[PDB]
Symmetry: D4
Subunit: 207 residues, 8 copies
């Protein structure tokens, strides 16, 4: 709840809550096209049940404490569908995180019995946790976010550590750890390809 | 042009003391778990090619495999995603120093959606590739002259294409992008073998 | 409060305003086959006028006066259709318009749902019921549910336009929007002339 | 066929003291944010053409931009939606006096869905445009003769096409419709550059 | 509380059908007349009652029903008569030729929608709810359930009232002669289906 | 070597058309009758000659042509008459109602193919090559080119011969009454197109 | 609460399976047998109880289970046996060849619908509600949840009753020999899938 | 090329004292309940063929039906699924000893999706089949020479194709698979006649 959500303008005040080896990251934007739709919110969690919700201003190009986390190679950044978050973060702040774990890719490599790899479905199946998608289609650029917006934004990062632990168990069980690591290693370049103009192209397809 | 046809393996590596080798395969089809490797083609880029027939059930070819495993030799493919899969499935070795002219074309020939080898050879080299023998019995005990010449044609021009694509990648400042794609390409081939050949592992849905 | 009229507004006493919300109801989406049945208006004050248009009716002077008045912005949701049927029926094409569908497509970039019900729910927390959309709009006597539906289509457009204007300004798209609104009458004319299925600007 | 080839810009406007100029562009692809402007072609309609090679990183072209900004000169394009976008993106100036033969074709050649320049030139003028060089490296330091002839053919006939389409627009009483379309075209190109290139802004859904 | 008379094979007589128009529907084992037999024929005079006639496997005759179907003084009202006409003609060898179809009528009058199903039409025109739950059931069963019997009856209980409304709309929009021509071709459209053209719009360019 | 008489406005008289069936085709500015005007009407008596009639912008009458179109003792033969009937009725205010359509006949007889265009039918049944190059041309041109005129004539030169062969096949496969009912509805199918149903198969379930 | 016996590796014995027909289903990590391992085999004698057998990663034999699968005197009942047969033969090396499939049976008899899933069939023929919630779950888990165990049992608890009804319908519609032939080919259809034709209808023209 | 044309039936079985017979049909179309059987073609594989015109309403063809019922004679088809249906529909006898070159192609030519008789004849035999007469009036009282040659060409090569496919089925160890497909083929044809022609009975959905 709000007792464990901290809301910031522009950047984290410091990294006191992020002296950790992995951080859960998500974004909210005005849409899915980074060259048109600005970054509006960045959400973080340490995995301790709290979240930081950082409002990004129009035209903002810097956030040194957040960007230090994104650049710190000793901290794994956990995303759900990091392909998008990596693109908007690199586009906005000029830094592409390069140590990452993605729960969507992990799901596609382990939940081979379904085609539903969205966060809501994964949190339901793996954690019995209910995620509401209601605030996803809202004005994330508003000067003041609603309480429902803040709690929705925070819920997208509160569970990614636990999902990562379970997916790592499954990847070990099915002997796919090196496959997953190679996908994660390429994911920042997949994001770059999107920013450069190949967002509709599977670069590995025959045609 | 000279085309040397071999059974099982190269006799030696005397023509392949080189830094990059052009490689293609022919099979009974596109499903490596069903369709066996039938031919491996090589060229040093000198205008000659080696066409190696692979027997049913064959799982070794020491001279060929030495080249495929040699980290100091770049293996040049057109659509290496497939060739890497069938080579690793057959011989147990996954090359990890590669250049793929299809990926290179997709990163440089941004004005077209035609990234096949025939189209690329015609545009960049004014070389005409015939596709007629693509649909043939590559498992035949004796290949026809047309099969042999088609198989050789798939590797005779890859060095020249690689040089041009490298120029374009530099010109448009996409060298690090291409290198990352080539670095992931063996794992993309691995994903295909393990059961994800119909899945873009990076797509949202 | 909904005021129901036969044929035309009795007068323009309620419409000495800078902008008027407009919608239509018809027998379907093909102006050459499907007649104009209803024109709805609102001044923005939470009341509406619902004008039943008779089969074969060729004029409505008070309504056409508003539609032709260049000092009054006509607000539509998907004006592309309303402009076509109004011009086809009464012979006058409005040329000072604001369309909340176009404005939504220029500002609600986070969704592909640009219908009026979705927009009212999101921006106003107003629930639009679509149940009476598929009904006999040519009926001699409209049902209360029809009348309330038709009015609901115009009662909120002023409030939507104010919000969309703020977003257009925030994202610096005011002049893009203005140009789209400027072309919308000719887009409607293109539909009437036989290009309704053609994006005239597409390559193919 | 006299084709004058320039680096960067026209040397002067001596050939373009005219009321309408035919304009085309060649690029590395259809995405202006990725694919740079490589060539601008111009014709006064006298049977000659100017082919201007645009350098990578080139930000200005004062003589060409003078024509593009001159409100007394109609810029004639075939599918100006694209040309307007890449020119405005590259040099910062959006022409606002335009005629587009693709829009004119769609408003007059109502008996067909084939509105490409090759089709239009064949039907209206019995002139055969070859499309072979369309897929080529338009960023090459030296364009080939075939490339230069292709680039010129894109502009050599637009004046003649414009005259015929104007007659058909008059005959079918669609002049004001065409004029409104041409007037919105720069904003349609702007919409593309801003991120709506895949969206018919006027569609219901 | 709807009175539904269930019969084996045929109506016992035509006492309830000395009328100018009869509502007709069928139930079958599926939509392919050469494979899927006619199982049920439903009739209503429009008086709020219905007759539900179970057709046996291999049954080729039902003289009282077939008299109604052949009587040119009686308009047969269907919803999507294209199918019912086909299965009735295939089974009994008689093609009704005086018909009214509420689906065609809807397509010519409810121009503001693409939803021309009976359930949607009954809801809009009459504020009557049709349940579709029993549509996919074993219509060949020796004993139909009450749910099946009520479903079969609901298909015919409202066609007279629908026809009256559609006739008013056809007159208002001046489409009576258009509809009449469509109804007159409908038996031949059904015949075309039986002959092998069921997947072909015979009037299409391609 | 083929006699093609070109007229402006109308036939000068009916001297060449004291016959029991006439082949008819149209050319227009496109497939939308409300936007795309009738530009040409072509006729042939079946004697290897053709009349090509240019129709002016806004022209609404053509008394000799319309006498033929209205004459119930003269069958009008079309290929895809569905369209020709629509534009002719739209322009001249008369709907021909004694018609034969070689496209419908082909669909009812050439059951082994889905290629029912005039070029394919002429090649298969007559070994006659029809060129389509001039189909996409400006049929409103004040002066038609020789190639346009020959194309327009070729659309009507062979319809009698096609009709005779299709009538043999309809007889052989016993589909004459089916074809006749299709031809009888075709004017109303054209009317439906003009009234706003040109994209709707009025007989489809959905 | 249903009696469900949960086993590790194999049935302890065949004492509950001295019967003429056994209901069989499987659970796996997915639909690709060369990637997705067999995790569970479920059995029912038809007495309202089930056996749920957890199959370990890398397990290559299950002697009692395979005895049933290879017993030509015991009909193996599946719903969509095409998949179960493939994963069973791939895992244990034995292809059952005396089978009945309720999915094929449904396609041959429930001709009035295109919904041939187990849930829809159980709802219609038995008024039994199958929940599909646990279908997407980690079937490889060391400890299956009670929800998983009940779901896995529900897939075999009703197949005897369905088979009885479908045999009645196949007889009513005179399709017993067609159905038998389909069941006899089903093992080879599963083999074709394992060999690389899982996406190919081997009998299609193209 | 000797083609013997008969009315109704073979005059005798003198040319068919053989272990395998090549069979094809021609019809008025693909719907056996509407489109009658018009022609039945036979070849012993000796490079000659018999073309049997079947009359409208003909219910009997005793010599042909003797061959179709003879369990000592394999009936070779290309796409026997259809021919089996129209033959059983017309004469009441379903052959149950069959070989189908289309099924055999799908089981062996795994490198292509082109399994038509023309493609197969060109690849395996270098024989060119013309499809021109396929769309013709097969019900004509007098077939043209081109029709008769087309119908003969459909059976003249099936023995030679069967031999090659039998070699490939052996090579790839798929003989039992093919045999089971051929043994279900009559029931697949029966399924089509009973009303399942648009349904893959084995599909999940
Ligand atoms: N191409 C895409 N398709 C769908 N969602 C996308 C997307 N690109 C980015 N997203 C966003 O990335 C996340 C996808 O999550 P999911 O897999 O559950 O659909 C969502 O963000 P949020 O989680 O911040 O709402 C979604 O809005
Ligand atoms: N999914 C696929 N689609 C098309 N070709 C594929 C393929 N997988 C492998 N290939 C083969 O990889 C090469 C693709 O080449 P291209 O891009 O020109 O189509 C071809 O081999 P060959 O070059 O040996 O004929 C082709 O047979
Ligand atoms: N091509 C079209 N598609 C859908 N609705 C259309 C339409 N053309 C006109 N309309 C009508 O214009 C409005 C579109 O609204 P929306 O964007 O919410 O779907 C609706 O009118 P009403 O608001 O009067 O019902 C609808 O009936
Ligand atoms: N979305 C698009 N689709 C197709 N062609 C496009 C295009 N955008 C720009 N073009 C280019 O605009 C012109 C379209 O021409 P056409 O209508 O004849 O197809 C071509 O340029 P060029 O004429 O310089 O080759 C084409 O390369
Ligand atoms: N091609 C078809 N598509 C859908 N329904 C069809 C059909 N052919 C026949 N029917 C049946 O005709 C009626 C269609 O009605 P509707 O338009 O409301 O969908 C239904 O019968 P019932 O009304 O007896 O259930 C339906 O089962
Ligand atoms: N919807 C449509 N689709 C295709 N052709 C159409 C058509 N409507 C009218 N036509 C015209 O009707 C005729 C159909 O011919 P076909 O069956 O050979 O394609 C052609 O005329 P013309 O013969 O005068 O060129 C064609 O131009
Ligand atoms: N291609 C496929 N499509 C859908 N389900 C498939 C399938 N292959 C195997 N299955 C499985 O076979 C059964 C199909 O059931 P249905 O016909 O009701 O959809 C399901 O198993 P379970 O019954 O054990 O869940 C499903 O998981
Ligand atoms: N569903 C179908 N699709 C295509 N052809 C079919 C068919 N059913 C039957 N046929 C006929 O079966 C043969 C298929 O051949 P192919 O595989 O080469 O396309 C052809 O006959 P003919 O060979 O006698 O002409 C074709 O006319």
């Amino acid at each position: 709840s709000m007792t464990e959500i901290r809301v910031h303008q522009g950047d984290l005040p410091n990294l006191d809550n992020y002296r950790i080896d992995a951080v859960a990251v998500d974004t909210e934007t005005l849409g899915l096209q980074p060259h048109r739709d600005r970054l509006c919110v960045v959400q973080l969690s340490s995995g301790d049940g709290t979240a930081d919700v950082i409002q990004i201003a129009k035209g903002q190009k810097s956030a040194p404490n957040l960007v230090r986390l994104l650049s710190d190679r000793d901290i794994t950044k956990i995303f759900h569908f990091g392909r998008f978050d990596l693109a908007i973060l690199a586009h906005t702040f000029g830094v592409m995180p390069d140590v990452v774990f993605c729960t969507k890719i992990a799901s596609k490599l382990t939940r081979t019995y379904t085609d539903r790899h969205g966060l809501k479905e994964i949190c339901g199946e793996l954690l019995n946790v209910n995620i509401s998608k209601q605030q996803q289609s809202s004005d994330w650029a508003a000067e003041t976010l609603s309480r429902a917006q803040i709690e929705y934004a925070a819920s997208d990062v509160l569970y990614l550590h636990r999902l990562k632990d379970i997916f790592e168990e499954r990847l070990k069980r099915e002997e796919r750890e090196s496959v997953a690591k190679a996908c994660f290693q390429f994911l920042p370049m997949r994001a770059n390809l999107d920013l450069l103009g190949w967002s509709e192209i599977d670069i590995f397809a025959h045609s």
